[PDB]
Amino acid sequence: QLTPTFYDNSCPNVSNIVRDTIVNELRSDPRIAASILRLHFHDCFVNGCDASILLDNTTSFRTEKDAFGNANSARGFPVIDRMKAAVESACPRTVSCADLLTIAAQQSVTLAGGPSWRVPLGRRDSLQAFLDLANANLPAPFFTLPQLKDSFRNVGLNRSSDLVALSGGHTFGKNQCRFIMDRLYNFSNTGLPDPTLNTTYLQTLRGLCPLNGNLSALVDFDLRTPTIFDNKYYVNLEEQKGLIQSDQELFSSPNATDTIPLVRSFANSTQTFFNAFVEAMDRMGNITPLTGTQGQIRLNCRVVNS
Numbered sequence: 001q002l003t004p005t006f007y008d009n010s011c012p013n014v015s016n017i018v019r020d021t022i023v024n025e026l027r028s029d030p031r032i033a034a035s036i037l038r039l040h041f042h043d044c045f046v047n048g049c050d051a052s053i054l055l056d057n058t059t060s061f062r063t064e065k066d067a068f069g070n071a072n073s074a075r076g077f078p079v080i081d082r083m084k085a086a087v088e089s090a091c092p093r094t095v096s097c098a099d100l101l102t103i104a105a106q107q108s109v110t111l112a113g114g115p116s117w118r119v120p121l122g123r124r125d126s127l128q129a130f131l132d133l134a135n136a137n138l139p140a141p142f143f144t145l146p147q148l149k150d151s152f153r154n155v156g157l158n159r160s161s162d163l164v165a166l167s168g169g170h171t172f173g174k175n176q177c178r179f180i181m182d183r184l185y186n187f188s189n190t191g192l193p194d195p196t197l198n199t200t201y202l203q204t205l206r207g208l209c210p211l212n213g214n215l216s217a218l219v220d221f222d223l224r225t226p227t228i229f230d231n232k233y234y235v236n237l238e239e240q241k242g243l244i245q246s247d248q249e250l251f252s253s254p255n256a257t258d259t260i261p262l263v264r265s266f267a268n269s270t271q272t273f274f275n276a277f278v279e280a281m282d283r284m285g286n287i288t289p290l291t292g293t294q295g296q297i298r299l300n301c302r303v304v305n306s
């Protein structure tokens with residue numbers, strides 16, 4: 001029962017406030033649009049899009065920010081605080097942090113050249129955070145294709161089109177050397193590189209991520225257009241130039257009979273990818289929301305109201 005018109009009477013300019021915050025932030029941090037999209041993904045995969053990920057530690061629950069998928073990885077929380085403060089100034093006690101993050105994710109994709117659409121709204125904010133659930137639910141870059149599929153199925157995204165389209169989020173943003181070292185030097189305990197990685201690209205990545213190098217050094221997910229939201233992600237996969245294992249699995253796994261045609265169709269038509277990305281984003285945004293009088297309108301996104 002989420003609806004795109006939820007704030008049309010109570011805070012009609014919310015989307016513009018969000019967009020203006022991201023644009024101002026992009027002036028100093030060109031990565032923030034990618035980081036915000038990822039925060040929304042990590043919100044939704046853990047008890048639904050309920051802003052659980054934004055809560056700080058308390059003595060009764062641990063923050064999801066300490067999860068393996070978030071710690072020293074997720075970023076942009078201060079930007080969310082800034083846009084929440086601005087929306088609170090304009091429409092007090094009205095817009096949930098969960099909806100704010102959803103809007104910010106959509107605006108981030110559009111600002112980077114991606115599709116533009118009106119997200120469903122009406123989510124409410126959780127009363128707790130779910131660290132253990134984050135550690136169980138968030139997929140990992142060394143997952144095989146059946147494990148990736150199971151990770152999406154576990155949160156309610158059954159369709160291979162969900163997985164292939166949402167993986168297109170890696171058409172922009174950055175990845176730490178840590179998560180590709182195995183592919184470059186010791187894949188599956190062979191002491192050898194991943195044979196599905198293009199051998200010329202292998203040499204490039206070894207130059208960026210040497211053995212004994214800084215594991216926190218960042219590499220672009222999309223070697224073609226690292227900052228533009230477009231379908232080049234899938235073109236890379238067809239050339240064996242997916243960056244992390246879970247990217248290339250979509251095209252090269254023995255289990256990819258159903259994902260290969262999707263990768264090819266998205267590589268062949270930007271419109272096909274953009275349509276599928278919006279559809280999959282709206283489904284992800286629909287994972288187990290609190291609505292109505294459930295949850296609250298959190299006033300400070302880091303803490304429950306008191």
Ligand code: HEM
Pocket residue numbers: 031033034035036037038041072073074075139140141142143148166167169170172173174175176179244246
């Ligand atoms: C399918 C399983 C997925 C896996 C295994 C995965 C894994 C990763 C990893 C390892 C990173 C780098 C994090 C770091 O270096 O600290 C990353 C970044 C990113 N992920 Fe994914 N991810 C997945 C799905 C998604 C989805 C569904 C989205 C959004 C629709 C997404 C959007 C992003 C973005 C935008 C970044 C870059 C963030 C930044 O530069 O701050 N990913 N992901």
Ligand SMILES: O=P([O-])(O)O
Pocket residue numbers: 156283
């Ligand atoms: O796939 P649905 O029916 O949970 O939207």
Ligand SMILES: [Ca+2]
Pocket residue numbers: 042043044045046047048049050051052053
């Ligand atoms: Ca959540």
Ligand SMILES: [Ca+2]
Pocket residue numbers: 170171172222224225226227228229230231232233
């Ligand atoms: Ca791109």
